Symmetry: C5
Subunit: 216 residues, 5 copies
């Protein structure tokens, strides 16, 4: 077992501290530090360091739930890369959470007894749990373009709130367009209304408005 | 396929966050991270991370348009480094945008089937699209030297606004000179007017004014 | 003897300066720089640099006390990895604190005469002393959720103050739950009260409240 | 040809942005990045990135003037390390500024045709031009010690303004001394006046005043 | 001769700029960059870059004085590692300050003619001069604990001012104790007075007060 660098962990913790849990740069950094299959000890200490107390509790809950789903799929298929062929290799949650015999508190023994399939399953479970908690911790129909706000800031805020919401993926573009048309105070409303071409994409609307906007 | 370092990507994202999209240092950094030919997956994720939502939409649009121009030039010349000699090697936009069969979401297969000419064409297209969006996202005839502003700040602001505008390249120096002469409040106006030598370059005017300026 | 990098020491000192003595990231960084067995000279200079004057005095006291406990255990067992089999290898506190003959002020001679068991015992003692001083230097029953404060901030503050207190480890979760129920101003109080399910964990309570909270 | 690292260039640009053009640390950093003989392309892009628009215009002017002086010295001596023995190796300004045939815009061809003497001459010329522009871009007889200002701040400000001025090098110390004596509000004036020893150096005056100053 | 990295020098200069000249971290960093024996050119340029103008003048003075003491000890002992056995190897101050023949302005020739004993003597002299100037550039009996100030801040400030003063080393602990007892506003005064145990060390007093302090 080789531990992760505390320098990388400190940089990731400061990234989470400044950018937040949900920024795409933060998720990219987590994916980076989630590259090699980690032992339960590694992921547990990593989340202990980078996350606050309450997000850490939420993450422990979510990780347990995802690992339980994994173990249900494992008992539903004896060909799991964590399982074996005989019944003596069936993987219990004590072995996944690092609670089994010969593993509690000892990362060396952990790395000894664990399977690579076990490691990758634990890692994917932890990543999904992190995503859930990030989506949970920190309203698009209440967003208006302020009287003094520029249009690119309004578009950024609106696209952020619409994509980070509970809508299906196939309903984001029409909603963003129809919110550009009805929000975005009446000067830009009339600018979009009197478009000789038909704008059928948020990017095209943004380009058109940026071209023909009233410089002020 | 080898991914780009998330450390470099984080540094580039913070550079774009503090300096903006159009600064020459930002374009130099992008050229740096645009050195090796990138796969559509790499450039797409890079622009997803460094750009906000609305600039990312604009960039997707511009990248598509530039790739379409490339494919028109490719059907206009069967000797494209992305094309082949026979008709079976003609490159479709699904293969350029990474949408073709065996490539959607898989960077390894992407790197397998793609040509080096394909990669360099995609990369140049993405760079040109980034330039377009940067020029589009964030008035030189309205610039005056404030009563309390120094002259080097006024010259910096004016040269910035004139070079980052829609003028032809051969019309920037005369405009900068004639704006130095008519803006730049009447003390410096008279200082430039009573120049025993003829100043025929913005640098020479700046040097002269910095020499003979009223220390205050 | 090889000294620790002043770059790492400067980074650790700034970490202690911004995050404090008790943050889990700071303790992780200290554990990182406490990886190889250090000589008394190294640990002494390290604590001189990273700690202020008063915490350094406290740490000297605590380190002495812990080393005295170690020496009592050593005279209680002749099989200490710092001791030897005969009486001529018994380790005095002058040899542990670096005060013995041939060691005062000289790290090379120190590294010469010291045992690896001596080094690891000194290191563990210094780590425990650092923990004591950190817990000592900088009230959970006085924590209320402010009228304008969000719930995740209140939960973070409360869990921090409860886990960094004098309670036994087996009494933190019930106290955190019962403080969520009685603090956390009456809207969230009624939200937790009318829970159709029984919430038996701080993480579950946090998840439930974050789901059903009044968006405002 | 190998390009300079954009990381070093970004760090140097931020150094120039925070410290300014004239700080000794900035000149040291420029000397550092001016260590290996650079091609006209390298120096031109470097100054384009680190300098603003108006300082870049000034620097282009100054670089041209210094290169013209170099070419005059070259036509005044056929043994220039840039020249050759016959008349066919005489170096024109198009070859120095990178404007000659086979060099315009191409750094590889540039590195091919250029001589090492050419490179070092271009580099020294660019360094001298940078020094000129830095001295030009951003009054010692108007400096007074404020009623609330400390003496080391006043001495720093005065020595800075005197050494960064148009005085000869052999006239700075007497001026600094006589400005310490006549500025530096009458308490320190009388403290310097009643000096039982004769102080004949700014450092000695500073030491004496720091010793006998009125602690307040 | 190999120059020191301008990156390390820039980091050290910023350390001196933020932390000051007298902080233990700054002295540790200087000791770090003072590890290999430096040539007079190196130390001179280093102090030119990291120190301001007035501290640099003070440091030149102090370095000269310390080198003169070294040369007096050298003429008092013909076995100096800088000296030789015959009279022709006697080391003059022109050779120490780098002013001798073949050394003025040339670091290569400097490194050629200088002895390793010369280098280490110059280096130790420069370090002692830096210590003197740092102690000189930027009152413990005037320190009171403010009505709103915490006790650890007061203890830090007091220990700093007492240890960075003109007292002998054997008089700091009693003074710190008696200042804890008479300063440190009457609540803590009575808390220390009514100590059932006798506190005979600043660390013990700090620990006792931190234990029994009035939480508020």
């Amino acid at each position: 077992w080789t531990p992760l660098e505390p320098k990388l962990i400190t940089r990731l913790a400061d990234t989470v501290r400044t950018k937040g849990l949900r920024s795409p740069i933060t998720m990219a950094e987590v994916e980076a530090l989630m590259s090699s299959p980690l032992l339960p000890h590694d992921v547990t200490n990593l989340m202990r360091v980078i996350l606050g107390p309450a997000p850490y509790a939420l993450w422990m809950d979510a990780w347990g739930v995802q690992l339980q789903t994994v173990i249900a799929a494992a008992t539903r298929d004896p060909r799991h890369p964590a399982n074996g062929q005989g019944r003596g290799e069936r993987t219990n949650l004590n072995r996944l959470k690092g609670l089994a015999d010969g593993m509690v508190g000892n990362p060396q023994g952990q790395a000894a007894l664990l399977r690579p399939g076990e490691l990758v399953a634990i890692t994917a479970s932890a990543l999904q749990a992190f995503r859930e908690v990030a989506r949970l911790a920190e309203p698009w129909a209440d967003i208006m373009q302020g009287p003094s706000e520029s249009f690119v800031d309004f578009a950024n805020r609106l696209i952020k709130a619409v994509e980070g919401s509970d809508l299906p993926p196939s309903a984001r573009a029409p909603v963003i367009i129809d919110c550009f048309r009805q929000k975005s105070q009446p000067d830009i409303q009339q600018l979009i209304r009197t478009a000789p071409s038909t704008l059928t994409t948020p990017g095209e609307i943004i380009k058109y408005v940026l071209d023909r906007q009233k410089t002020a």
